[PDB]
Amino acid sequence: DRKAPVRPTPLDRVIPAPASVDPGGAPYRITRGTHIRVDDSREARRVGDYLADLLRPATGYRLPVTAHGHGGIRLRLAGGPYGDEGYRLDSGPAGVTITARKAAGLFHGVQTLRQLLPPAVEKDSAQPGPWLVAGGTIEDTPRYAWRSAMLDVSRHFFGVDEVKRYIDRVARYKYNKLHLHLSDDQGWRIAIDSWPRLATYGGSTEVGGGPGGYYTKAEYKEIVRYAASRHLEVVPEIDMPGHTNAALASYAELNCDGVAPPLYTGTKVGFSSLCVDKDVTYDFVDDVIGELAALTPGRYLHIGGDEAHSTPKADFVAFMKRVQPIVAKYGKTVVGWHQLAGAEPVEGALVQYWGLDRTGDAEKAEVAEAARNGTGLILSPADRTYLDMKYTKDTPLGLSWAGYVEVQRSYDWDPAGYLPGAPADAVRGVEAPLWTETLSDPDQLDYMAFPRLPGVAELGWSPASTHDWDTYKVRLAAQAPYWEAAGIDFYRSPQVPWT
Numbered sequence: 235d236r237k238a239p240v241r242p243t244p245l246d247r248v249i250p251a252p253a254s255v256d257p258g259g260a261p262y263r264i265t266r267g268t269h270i271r272v273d274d275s276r277e278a279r280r281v282g283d284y285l286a287d288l289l290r291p292a293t294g295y296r297l298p299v300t301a302h303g304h305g306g307i308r309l310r311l312a313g314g315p316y317g318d319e320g321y322r323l324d325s326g327p328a329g330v331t332i333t334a335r336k337a338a339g340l341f342h343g344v345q346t347l348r349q350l351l352p353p354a355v356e357k358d359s360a361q362p363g364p365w366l367v368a369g370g371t372i373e374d375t376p377r378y379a380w381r382s383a384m385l386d387v388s389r390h391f392f393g394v395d396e397v398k399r400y401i402d403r404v405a406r407y408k409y410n411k412l413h414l415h416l417s418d419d420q421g422w423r424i425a426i427d428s429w430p431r432l433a434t435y436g437g438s439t440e441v442g443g444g445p446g447g448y449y450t451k452a453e454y455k456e457i458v459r460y461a462a463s464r465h466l467e468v469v470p471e472i473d474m475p476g477h478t479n480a481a482l483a484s485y486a487e488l489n490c491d492g493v494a495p496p497l498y499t500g501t502k503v504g505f506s507s508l509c510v511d512k513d514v515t516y517d518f519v520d521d522v523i524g525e526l527a528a529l530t531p532g533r534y535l536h537i538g539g540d541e542a543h544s545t546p547k548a549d550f551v552a553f554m555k556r557v558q559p560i561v562a563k564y565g566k567t568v569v570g571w572h573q574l575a576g577a578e579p580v581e582g583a584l585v586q587y588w589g590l591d592r593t594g595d596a597e598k599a600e601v602a603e604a605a606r607n608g609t610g611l612i613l614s615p616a617d618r619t620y621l622d623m624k625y626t627k628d629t630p631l632g633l634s635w636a637g638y639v640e641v642q643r644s645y646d647w648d649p650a651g652y653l654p655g656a657p658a659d660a661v662r663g664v665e666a667p668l669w670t671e672t673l674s675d676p677d678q679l680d681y682m683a684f685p686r687l688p689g690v691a692e693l694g695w696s697p698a699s700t701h702d703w704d705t706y707k708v709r710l711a712a713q714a715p716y717w718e719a720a721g722i723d724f725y726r727s728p729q730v731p732w733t
């Protein structure tokens with residue numbers, strides 16, 4: 235009965251592991267007459283409508299959302315110790331109530347609710363259920379505030395609808411930030427009015443050749459809006475001064491020798507550089523950052539900084555000294571890859587650590603030192619949470635430069651004690667990046683993102699006391715019939731005892 239169990243899933247069998255699970259009593263059962271009762275506010279109705287949309291196809295129930303009466307599913311905003319993102323979920327014969335201080339907390343409780351319901355909830359046509367929700371109480375708040383997924387749309391372009399699909403994948407696991415890698419050597423993916431060839435020329439291809447693509451400002455705004463409705467803050471990245479061939483190919487004047495390189499369709503890294511010694515470089519960066527900041531309601535702007543291997547170290551330092559303030563000039567907080575730690579992060583900056591177990595002590599120390607100097611740390615180790623990395627030598631997609639990363643390796647660590655010498659309170663959270671050198675359609679993104687994506691979300695969300703591979707893998711195994719019913723391809727790791 236994998237597909238429609240006789241009994242409800244246990245209250246604690248959700249990912250991320252909730253901070254507190256107190257099972258008891260009889261379950262709630264959704265039936266054809268169940269109403270979704272919300273507060274009389276637009277933002278409460280928005281979460282109710284989102285929930286109703288998730289449940290209508292598989293139940294075939296009306297599930298009206300209203301602000302009157304005693305509905306069997308109640309979403310309510312109230313004072314409580316749940317913070318900006320936490321919630322309480324109460325379940326029993328009298329109904330399900332999700333209580334939070336903010337809409338994002340109600341939204342997170344909905345993500346829990348959809349895992350308490352059975353896998354048939356994922357289907358697009360009406361199903362018998364039964365639509366049971368285990369009885370008891372869950373109280374849940376996040377460990378870290380930076381819980382991020384990245385999608386590379388530079389190596390292969392993914393359009394608005396494909397990004398919305400990826401957004402809905404990550405929303406399941408309470409990620410709250412979406413990092414978009416909007417430019418690299420093989421593509422420039424955001425239209426800039428002051429430099430119109432970036433998109434029309436630099437966006438014209440991708441890895442492997444053929445058509446590429448880019449977002450108009452209207453499309454980018456729609457991605458941001460859709461992400462916001464799934465409580466994801468969009469963090470855009472324009473990588474500089476390396477990984478810049480698409481821009482360089484578009485404007486001859488940006489290049490050291492004044493010659494535009496060809497458009498690049500390979501998969502090498504490290505070979506491109508903005509010209510640090512030319513004034514037009516900083517006009518360009520200021521134009522791009524200013525236009526991107528105007529489209530970005532979130533707090534953060536990512537300037538990259540990785541693999542500027544055609545930029546001599548002293549020039550990289552000078553470049554970063556000059557461009558970091560452009561970000562604050564347009565009202566945003568700088569984020570960069572942890573190479574920025576070698577180039578004097580400005581106050582308030584965060585750096586994203588993509589090192590590995592084998593990274594040298596000196597490099598780790600430079601990052602721990604920036605943490606001591608007040609730089610926030612985002613942890614996305616390339617041998618842990620890079621979702622493009624192969625599971626084993628036989629994986630048919632992805633890369634292997636960081637070694638192989640099976641499911642247990644991806645999950646089985648503690649952000650608080652990961653980087654030697656780094657103060658635990660400098661760790662802002664975690665990110666799971668999905669690079670797309672090898673991935674050109676949404677099914678391939680699913681196969682590499684799943685099943686490690688929920689594990690990185692748990693590292694960002696769950697208390698360290700709940701962390702345990704042997705019991706986590708049981709909760710992970712339980713996702714198989716959900717993913718199967720939803721059409722989500724995933725790697726059936728032999729480490730996981732799949733349901």
Ligand SMILES: CC(=O)N[C@@H]1[C@@H](O)[C@H](O)[C@@H](CO)O[C@H]1O
Binds near residue numbers: 540622671
């Ligand atoms: C910060 C970073 O990750 N840089 C590159 C990235 O451009 C590339 O897509 C990835 C593939 O795993 O390998 C890294 O070396």
